[PDB]
Amino acid sequence: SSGSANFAGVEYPLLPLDQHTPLLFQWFERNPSRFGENQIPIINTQQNPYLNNIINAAIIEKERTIGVLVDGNFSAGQKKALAKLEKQYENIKVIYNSDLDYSMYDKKLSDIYLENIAKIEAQPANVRDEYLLGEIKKSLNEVLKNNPEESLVSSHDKRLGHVRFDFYRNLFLLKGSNAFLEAGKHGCHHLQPGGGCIYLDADMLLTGKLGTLYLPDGIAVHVSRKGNSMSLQNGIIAVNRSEHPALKKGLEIMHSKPYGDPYIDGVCGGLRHYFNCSIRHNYEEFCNFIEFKHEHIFMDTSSLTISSWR
Numbered sequence: 609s610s611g612s613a614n615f616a617g618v619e620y621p622l623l624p625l626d627q628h629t630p631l632l633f634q635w636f637e638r639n640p641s642r643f644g645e646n647q648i649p650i651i652n653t654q655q656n657p658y659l660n661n662i663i664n665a666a667i668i669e670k671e672r673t674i675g676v677l678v679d680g681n682f683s684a685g686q687k688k689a690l691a692k693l694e695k696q697y698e699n700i701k702v703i704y705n706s707d708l709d710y711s712m713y714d715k716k717l718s719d720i721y722l723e724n725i726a727k728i729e730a731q732p733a734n735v736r737d738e739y740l741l742g743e744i745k746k747s748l749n750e751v752l753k754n755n756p757e758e759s760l761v762s763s764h765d766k767r768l769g770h771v772r773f774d775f776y777r778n779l780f781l782l783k784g785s786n787a788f789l790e791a792g793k794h795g796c797h798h799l800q801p802g803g804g805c806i807y808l809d810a811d812m813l814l815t816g817k818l819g820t821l822y823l824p825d826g827i828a829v830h831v832s833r834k835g836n837s838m839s840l841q842n843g844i845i846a847v848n849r850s851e852h853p854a855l856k857k858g859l860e861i862m863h864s865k866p867y868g869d870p871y872i873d874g875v876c877g878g879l880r881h882y883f884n885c886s887i888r889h890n891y892e893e894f895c896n897f898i899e900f901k902h903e904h905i906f907m908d909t910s911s912l913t914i915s916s917w918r
């Protein structure tokens with residue numbers, strides 16, 4: 609521990625994330641056919657040189673495990689290319705999302721709907737959200753018509769866009785360093801069970817070594833300052849431990865809300881609940897408090913060109 613930062617009447621120690629804390633990048637590919645059969649299936653265009661950025665981060669942080677969480681229907685040659693990348697850079701560990709078991713974070717959709725119907729019925733009739741009650745009842749009806757066993761994981765798994773890799777990003781960060789050991793990644797000499805993790809968007813250009821970070825209660829996230837507004841953002845998520853209470857609270861919210869969003873609820877909601885940033889608090893002050901800052905990271909370079917999913 610170093611100093612401390614105040615927010616909403618609570619004093620938070622700036623907890624350390626040592627230099628052995630692993631870095632984490634993520635590539636979930638919807639269209640693996642846009643790469644060669646023996647190509648590394650991670651985008652690497654002039655506008656989005658993301659494979660190059662990852663390799664540059666692995667070269668700069670030579671004494672740090674660099675995890676690449678990948679997903680998509682990859683061809684055999686593409687997987688062999690990923691293994692070749694793992695061999696060309698010792699610290700790069702490729703983790704296939706399908707090799708991780710996320711069932712311990714799952715919940716039945718019908719259970720969420722039933723609990724919400726009970727909790728709307730348990731409140732005085734003059735304040736019940738009746739429109740929401742109706743929408744939850746239609747959602748449950750459709751679940752019973754199409755797949756009664758539908759769950760958070762399975763429903764998000766069927767998504768084809770950013771929501772899916774947001775969801776799995778949060779779950780992986782809950783696993784923390786433990787995900788590396790669960791996937792059988794050998795030679796991760798520095799990883800401790802229960803260790804943390806620093807997730808970075810691939811467009812977060814490292815220009816130097818990160819050293820040791822000091823974050824309030826051991827967590828910080830990106831703050832986008834595009835144009836005249838600012839917003840909490842999951843483009844960077846640094847935690848000093850597995851099962852971090854802020855991300856665990858985001859998962860709690862998603863277990864309780866009928867239509868929880870991995871970003872709005874799993875990240876922003878969890879942070880604001882954990883740190884007591886209500887709608888009556890200053891959102892800008894909280895952004896300044898929780899912001900992940902670093903002089904050796906050129907942040908969100910995808911805004912100089914085009915977004916890879918937009």
Ligand SMILES: O=c1ccn([C@@H]2O[C@H](COP(=O)(O)OP(=O)(O)O)[C@@H](O)[C@H]2O)c(=O)[nH]1
Pocket residue numbers: 633634635636637638773808809810811843908910911914915916917918
């Ligand atoms: O097909 C895609 C597009 C994006 N991403 C992930 O989304 C992140 C954000 O990419 P980018 O910075 O281009 O988007 P932005 O959110 O800045 O618009 C990337 O780093 C990847 O982890 C992905 O996995 N697959």
Ligand SMILES: CC(=O)N[C@@H]1[C@@H](O)[C@H](O)[C@@H](CO)O[C@H]1O
Pocket residue numbers: 770771774841842843871
């Ligand atoms: C301005 C914008 O698009 N922000 C998106 C956010 O909505 C999304 O939840 C997140 C994860 O995909 O990526 C950000 O870049």
Ligand SMILES: [Mg+2]
Pocket residue numbers: 809811843908909910911
């Ligand atoms: Mg970006």
